């Protein structure tokens, strides 16, 4: 199948489904719609926001690296055992660019601070393959180092932007927009 996610990239077979939206009958990714059981969504983003959506912008694609992230993360019950190893599950690695790998370290510092992913010095053991990771108390991911990671499903901290499984109106998918604003903007 062509594959129409508004994320517009290329997810490895083995980290996702592929749903169809029953509106416009394109295929799109299971993790950038909230793991949500079964074949189908109702009304894909494109369809819920409707013909003036630009998916192309920094911001949304900052969006659905997050919930792409989140709900890997989820499915897989954790944090695999290194950065390189989550880089190349969320992403082909054939596809990795710079832009990329800089989205998902703010994916995963955002998730940290959070409180979705909790870091300590020694949940599972990551190792660290890759610079530029910031999160609470620690500070920078030692590139070289491994660290524990304990994985929570939600917390107070959270962003309803990943956590929301479906979209549901246009007004709910501009405010997801606009907390990956508000989250760059504080990063
Ligand atoms: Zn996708
Ligand atoms: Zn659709």
């Known amino acids: 199948p062509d594959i129409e996610c508004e994320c517009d990239l290329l997810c490895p077979i083995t980290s996702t489904r592929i749903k169809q ?3 416009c009958r394109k295929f799109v990714h299971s993790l950038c719609y909230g793991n ?4 189908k969504v109702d ?3 494109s369809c819920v926001y409707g013909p003036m959506f630009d998916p192309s912008s920094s911001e ?3 969006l659905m690296m997050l919930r792409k992230c989140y709900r890997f993360l989820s499915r897989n019950k954790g944090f695999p055992p ?3 190893e989550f880089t190349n599950s969320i992403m082909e690695e054939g596809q990795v660019t710079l832009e990329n790998i800089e989205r998902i370290n703010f994916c ?3 998730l940290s601070s959070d409180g979705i992913l909790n870091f300590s010095q020694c949940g599972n053991k990551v190792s660290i393959d890759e610079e530029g990771i910031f ?3 620690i500070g920078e991911l030692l590139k070289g ?3 524990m990671c304990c994985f929570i499903y939600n917390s107070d901290n959270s962003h309803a932007c990943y956590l929301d499984v479906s979209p549901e109106s246009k007004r709910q998918i501009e405010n997801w927009i606009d907390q990956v604003k508000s989250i760059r903007n504080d990063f």
């Open 21 to 23: 939206c029953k509106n």
């Open 36 to 39: 949500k059981p079964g074949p």
């Open 43 to 45: 009304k894909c983003i």
């Open 60 to 62: 949304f694609k900052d």
């Open 82 to 84: 290194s950065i390189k």
């Open 108 to 110: 995963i510092s955002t």
């Open 135 to 137: 999160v609470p108390k």
């Open 145 to 147: 180092r491994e660290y």
